[PDB]
Amino acid sequence: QCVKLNDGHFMPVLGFGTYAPPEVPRSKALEVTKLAIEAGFRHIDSAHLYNNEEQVGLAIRSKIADGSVKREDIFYTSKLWSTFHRPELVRPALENSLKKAQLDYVDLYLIHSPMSLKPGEELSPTDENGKVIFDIVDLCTTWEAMEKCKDAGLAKSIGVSNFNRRQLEMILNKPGLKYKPVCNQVECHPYFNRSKLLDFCKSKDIVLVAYSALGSQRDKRWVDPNSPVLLEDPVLCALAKKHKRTPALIALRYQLQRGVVVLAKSYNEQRIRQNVQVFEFQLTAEDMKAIDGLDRNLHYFNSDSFASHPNYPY
Ligand SMILES: NC(=O)c1ccc[n+]([C@@H]2O[C@H](COP(=O)([O-])OP(=O)(O)OC[C@H]3O[C@@H](n4cnc5c(N)ncnc54)[C@H](OP(=O)(O)O)[C@@H]3O)[C@@H](O)[C@H]2O)c1
Ligand SMILES: Cc1noc(C)c1COc1ccccc1C(=O)Nc1cccc(Cl)c1
Numbered sequence: 001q002c003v004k005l006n007d008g009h010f011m012p013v014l015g016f017g018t019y020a021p022p023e024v025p026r027s028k029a030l031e032v033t034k035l036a037i038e039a040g041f042r043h044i045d046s047a048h049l050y051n052n053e054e055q056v057g058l059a060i061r062s063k064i065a066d067g068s069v070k071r072e073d074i075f076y077t078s079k080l081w082s083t084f085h086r087p088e089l090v091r092p093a094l095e096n097s098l099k100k101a102q103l104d105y106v107d108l109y110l111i112h113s114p115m116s117l118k119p120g121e122e123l124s125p126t127d128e129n130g131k132v133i134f135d136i137v138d139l140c141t142t143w144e145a146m147e148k149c150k151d152a153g154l155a156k157s158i159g160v161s162n163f164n165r166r167q168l169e170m171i172l173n174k175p176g177l178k179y180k181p182v183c184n185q186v187e188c189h190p191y192f193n194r195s196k197l198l199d200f201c202k203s204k205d206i207v208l209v210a211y212s213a214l215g216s217q218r219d220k221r222w223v224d225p226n227s228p229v230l231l232e233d234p235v236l237c238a239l240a241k242k243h244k245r246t247p248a249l250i251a252l253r254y255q256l257q258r259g260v261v262v263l264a265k266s267y268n269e270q271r272i273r274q275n276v277q278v279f280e281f282q283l284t285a286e287d288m289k290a291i292d293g294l295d296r297n298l299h300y301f302n303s304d305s306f307a308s309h310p311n312y313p314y
Helices: 027-039 053-065 087-101 139-152 165-172 195-202 234-242 247-256 269-280 285-292
Strands: 002-004 010-012 014-017 043-045 075-080 106-111 155-161 183-187 207-211 261-265
Touching (some): 010 075, 027 043, 027 053, 027 269, 075 087, 155 165, 234 247, 234 285
Parallel strands (some): 014 043, 043 075, 155 183, 207 261
16 A cells, blocks of 8 residues: 655555654554564554654564564665754765664655754754754755665665645755655644645655655644544544444545655554554545545644744745
8 A cells, every 4th residue: 555656666544653752651652563463554653853763764674574564664764953954964874874773775865854954963952042053955955865865775665744835845946856755744634634745746746755644643742732633523533433434444544545745643553553443444526525624733742932033835
């Protein structure tokens, strides 16, 4: 169950989200990634930011080793963090992510954010006054370093994440371009459905990948507790009763039926197993336009600290 990418390789349309807050013990990312693979996931979304590539790579390496799966069956994804946007820091970051996860290549390497941060070992550098230190980098130079990684064979496909239309065209309107981004991974869910951005990506053979499709983890550091909880929407709860399903399954099927590759994080065995069942039912045209009307342009990620960056995507 995949969608062909604009460089030839294939991406499973349902992916597993591996991020959990640092409060969650690192051993969990190993247990739930194996359970996700046993449940039927073959697309695994990770990143250098999530501090989990060893447990994730170990789980992948262990399911390959016990004979459940082979390396070609697994679509593994990592992301270049924003402190590594200077072109010389790109390949060492990917090799470090490969060394950490113990894989010879990633199926997908993404530019995690367009908001470049100052290079360093800190995932978020902060100055004297406790504010985040930005950095100015021409992102097309970063993409060239990304392109070389695909040539080197460390990344089967390369793409971006949290890129708006203007930032996407900057990559497409790049001189000497060799590989267009196979995908743009952005926040997408019935309350914020990226309809105009999805049309643009469709018009460029670029796959839109939805993160926070279930309505996000609502971490206290980045989300307002008064913001609407997507899985409590009366419309989503109503359709789940009609189809005898769950509100999460309604949200996941919503993206799968408009050409969106959808991610879903879960560290709960039953909900992990519950999410693969999105392929067992279908939404009607009436159900699709009912969810269509829920768009209220709601960013679950909100950060005024990152509102002053020249490349902030929204
Ligand atoms: N490119 C980027 O900038 C970016 C940003 C954010 C996230 N991501 C990636 O996208 C992945 C998913 O996004 P997300 O972190 O916002 O989480 P999410 O997919 O929106 O899920 C939100 C919450 O819903 C719960 N859940 C999972 N399955 C459920 C089900 N069947 N029914 C009810 N609840 C369910 C989960 O809690 P339980 O664990 O308890 O089940 C989960 O924490 C992340 O893991 C990350 O890899 C990428
Ligand atoms: C927009 C956008 N542009 O880049 C990113 C990444 C995003 C979305 O970010 C999130 C979405 C969902 C949940 C969490 C996050 C997040 O934790 N962002 C973050 C941003 C900057 C620094 C650091 Cl440390 C974290």
